[PDB]
């Protein structure tokens, strides 16, 4: 019943700077433990055994270090190939054996504002008596935006989806959807539609709108 | 090699079975302790079983103890995972792995698999209602435009967007499908530089392999 944490959940770095993740036991593992890199599509690889040893193969600026319950991870010259997450596993007694929550390893880049786009219900949808209303953000760093829903001078939560996609390997850019789902008869209710991003990149909201009776 | 290769997974109802199975190459897999390894949506890792080298001890931890059975064949280098009245808790993808030791103890995992997809659910396999989405009116027109397919009210995972643009190009960005009144919505995006359409047709096609349905939906300007 082991304990790992590793206390940060996600880090930023720029390439060829040294990165260092960590992992806490709740008691002394001697030595036992493993560090795997899991890839965002699915792939994982050990890197590093027994604290500091080296998985046949893996590039030698992956180092470990530790000892009783104190262990990390420290990337000497970050490449992007090493996007990726990062967990710590315990190995003392099989089958005993826990991970820690992992750790996202996130490439630093240029500020960039998002390409905002609305986009009303489709007739077909609301034929169906349906009424989605979307909005794509796309292209943006950093990560963190706030993107929220007012209809006639009400801001909305309820029925909102927000799915981001991972770091884009070719810009290192991130992007999201945010979905408004309401019938056909609460989006009749309301005129105004506005899709509003808060991001460090405009002093002032962001914001895309439209009036349902056009 | 050395190769990890699962299969067997797909979409049970609640209180199911399954069985999985790994197809090992690239090495002698009598020597090894070998185990099965899931992780949650949620992405949390954990043990699920383990087996030593000739499977007659087998290793189990509470969480698992036993409505999950691990076995092995080492003349067909294979190891098996066997599981009953499953929950959607075990709702997860499940990695084969090679457990490595020294001479006292069995401490890591030294090559994985690349993962099967295990869906524990009681909702009906329902293919996707696709809408496209245009630019409501009217502009900035911009320099590039913006183009998107919603995706919504499918089960199981998962779909396929492709994008019909026809000869032109553009990039894509695929949204990672979310839960919602009991089914998956997801969404893509295309972008296209704006002198290019609405003259040019553009079309998002959907696949969903579970219910074996296609749909092609063209992107109205009206
Ligand atoms: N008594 C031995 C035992 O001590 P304990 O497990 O109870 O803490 O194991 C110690 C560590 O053994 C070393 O384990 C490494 C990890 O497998 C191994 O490296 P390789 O696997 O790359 O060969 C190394 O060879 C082992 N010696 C051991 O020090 C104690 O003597």
């Known amino acids: 019943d082991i304990v790992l944490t590793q206390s940060t959940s996600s880090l930023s770095a720029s390439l060829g700077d040294r990165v260092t993740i960590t992992c806490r036991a709740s008691?002394?593992?001697?030595?036992?433990l493993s560090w795997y890199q899991q890839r965002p599509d699915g792939t994982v690889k050990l890197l590093i055994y027994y604290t500091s040893k080296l998985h046949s193969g893996v590039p030698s600026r992956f180092s470990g270090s530790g000892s009783g319950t104190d262990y990390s991870l420290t990337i000497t010259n970050l490449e992007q190939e090493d996007i990726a997450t990062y967990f710590c596993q315990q190995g003392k007694t099989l089958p005993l054996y826990t991970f820690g929550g992992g750790t996202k390893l996130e490439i630093k880049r240029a500020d960039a504002a998002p390409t905002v786009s609305i986009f009303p219900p489709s007739s077909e949808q609301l034929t169906s008596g349906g009424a989605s209303v979307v909005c794509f953000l796309n292209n943006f760093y950093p990560k963190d935006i706030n993107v929220k829903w007012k209809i006639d001078g009400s801001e909305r939560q309820n029925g909102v989806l927000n799915s981001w996609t991972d770091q884009d390997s070719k810009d290192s850019t991130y992007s999201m959807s945010s979905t408004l789902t309401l019938t056909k008869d609460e989006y009749e209710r309301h005129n105004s539609y506005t899709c509003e991003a808060t991001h460090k990149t405009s002093t002032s909201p962001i914001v895309k709108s439209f009036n349902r009776n056009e | 090699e050395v190769k990890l290769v699962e299969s067997g997974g797909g979409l049970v109802k609640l209180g199911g079975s399954l069985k999985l199975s790994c197809a090992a190459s690239?090495?002698?897999?009598?020597?090894?302790?070998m185990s099965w390894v899931r992780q949650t949506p949620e992405k949390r890792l954990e043990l699920v079983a383990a087996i030593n080298s000739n499977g007659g001890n087998t290793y189990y931890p509470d969480t698992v103890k036993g409505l999950f059975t691990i076995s092995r064949d080492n003349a067909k280098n294979t190891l098996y995972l066997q599981m009953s009245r499953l929950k959607s808790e075990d709702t997860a993808l499940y990695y084969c792995?090679?457990?490595?030791?020294?001479?006292?103890?069995?401490?890591?995992?030294?090559?994985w698999g690349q993962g099967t997809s295990v869906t524990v659910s009681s909702a009906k396999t329902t293919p996707p209602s696709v809408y496209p989405l245009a630019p409501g009116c009217g502009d900035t027109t911009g320099s590039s435009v913006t183009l998107g397919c919603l995706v919504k009210g499918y089960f199981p995972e998962s779909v396929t967007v492709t994008w019909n643009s026809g000869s032109l190009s553009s990039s894509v960005h695929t949204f990672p499908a979310l839960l919602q009144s009991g089914l998956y919505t997801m969404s893509s995006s295309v972008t296209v530089p704006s002198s290019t359409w609405p003259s040019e047709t553009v079309t998002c096609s959907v696949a969903h392999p579970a219910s074996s349905t296609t749909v092609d939906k063209k992107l109205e300007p009206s």
């Open positions: 792995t090679r457990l490595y030791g020294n001479y006292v103890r069995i401490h890591t995992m030294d090559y």
């Open positions: 008691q002394d593992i001697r030595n036992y």
């Open positions: 690239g090495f002698t897999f009598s020597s090894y302790y």
